[PDB]
Amino acid sequence: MENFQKVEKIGEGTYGVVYKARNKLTGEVVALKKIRLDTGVPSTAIREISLLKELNHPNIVKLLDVIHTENKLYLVFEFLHQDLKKFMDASALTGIPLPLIKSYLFQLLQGLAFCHSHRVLHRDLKPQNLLINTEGAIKLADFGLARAFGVPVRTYTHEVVTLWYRAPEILLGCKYYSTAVDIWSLGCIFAEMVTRRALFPGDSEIDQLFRIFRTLGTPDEVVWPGVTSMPDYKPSFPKWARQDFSKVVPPLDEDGRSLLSQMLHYDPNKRISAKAALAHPFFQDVTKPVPHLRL
Numbered sequence: 001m002e003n004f005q006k007v008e009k010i011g012e013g014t015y016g017v018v019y020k021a022r023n024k025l026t027g028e029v030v031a032l033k034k035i036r037l038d039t040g041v042p043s044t045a046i047r048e049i050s051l052l053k054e055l056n057h058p059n060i061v062k063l064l065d066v067i068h069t070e071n072k073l074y075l076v077f078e079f080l081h082q083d084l085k086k087f088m089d090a091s092a093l094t095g096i097p098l099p100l101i102k103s104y105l106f107q108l109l110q111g112l113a114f115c116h117s118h119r120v121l122h123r124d125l126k127p128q129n130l131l132i133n134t135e136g137a138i139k140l141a142d143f144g145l146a147r148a149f150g151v152p153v154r155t156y157t158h159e160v161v162t163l164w165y166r167a168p169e170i171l172l173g174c175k176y177y178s179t180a181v182d183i184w185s186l187g188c189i190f191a192e193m194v195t196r197r198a199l200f201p202g203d204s205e206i207d208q209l210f211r212i213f214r215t216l217g218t219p220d221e222v223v224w225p226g227v228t229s230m231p232d233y234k235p236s237f238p239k240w241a242r243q244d245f246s247k248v249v250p251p252l253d254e255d256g257r258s259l260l261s262q263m264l265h266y267d268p269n270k271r272i273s274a275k276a277a278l279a280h281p282f283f284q285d286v287t288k289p290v291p292h293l294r295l
């Protein structure tokens with residue numbers, strides 16, 4: 001801090017508070033995240049975070065500076081003016097126009113393609129972490145912070161962390177999950193943009209899993225070899241039949257439903273990569289429209 005002048009709270013992220021702040025030399029407005037340290041700050045968290053300062057991409061919220069003092073760490077991010085949650089709320093009556101949904105999905109997949117080529121995972125994608133600007137860009141925020149620490153189930157703020165976007169392999173207690181978890185979260189967000197309702201609004205871990213199962217079918221060894229040996233899998237899970245995607249995300253067109261199906265494959269190895277998603281036929285007519293943002 002010290003060179004920074006708080007102007008308002010824009011989020012109680014999972015790791016700390018997030019303020020809009022004005023840099024008191026350069027005059028730049030930034031998003032300041034005070035990170036809430038367990039005792040001190042692990043040096044490995046510091047080296048983990050430092051590598052992020054280099055992971056720069058048009059679709060990743062730029063980390064400007066990391067600033068360390070005793071039991072407070074600060075991350076200084078470029079400031080964007082709105083998150084996708086708020087923009088989706090704002091768009092609730094008419095929905096986001098599909099061309100703009102498509103552009104946002106395409107850009108994010110580009111972001112994810114980049115991170116994953118550097119072996120960096122987000123692990124916690126959600127509409128609150130997807131930030132937009134007036135020029136039609138969308139960016140991944142709060143990014144690779146999960147590996148740097150871990151994610152508590154209860155943030156310092158006593159708001160519950162959302163499970164709505166969590167890949168099934170995480171929920172079934174796999175320890176060493178992959179990039180494919182981010183593809184899953186992004187498909188849940190795609191679906192939500194299209195339908196204007198959360199796809200799997202779980203309010204505990206088993207409600208979340210049983211919501212996935214109801215829509216997609218209870219997974220078995222036919223669709224997900226190895227599933228039945230995962231740490232939190234129980235042979236006593238109820239066996240639901242799969243619903244059709246025509247019912248899940250109307251009125252998404254066939255290309256979009258086919259891409260979404262690949263993003264939502266149970267087996268993280270059959271799940272489409274970000275890079276392969278970019279070549280899907282759904283992005284043959286991609287464009288970059290301007291949102292109607294009300295700031």
Ligand SMILES: COCCNS(=O)(=O)c1ccc(Nc2nccc(-c3sc(=O)n(C)c3C)n2)cc1
Nearest residue numbers: 010013031077078079080081082083086141142
């Ligand atoms: C009433 O409005 C409250 C809803 N939040 S909001 O207004 O849409 C919003 C406004 C601005 C921002 N800006 C912003 N810019 C850069 C980074 C961030 C975030 S969001 C997040 O979780 N982190 C860690 C960061 C750095 N936020 C984020 C959210």
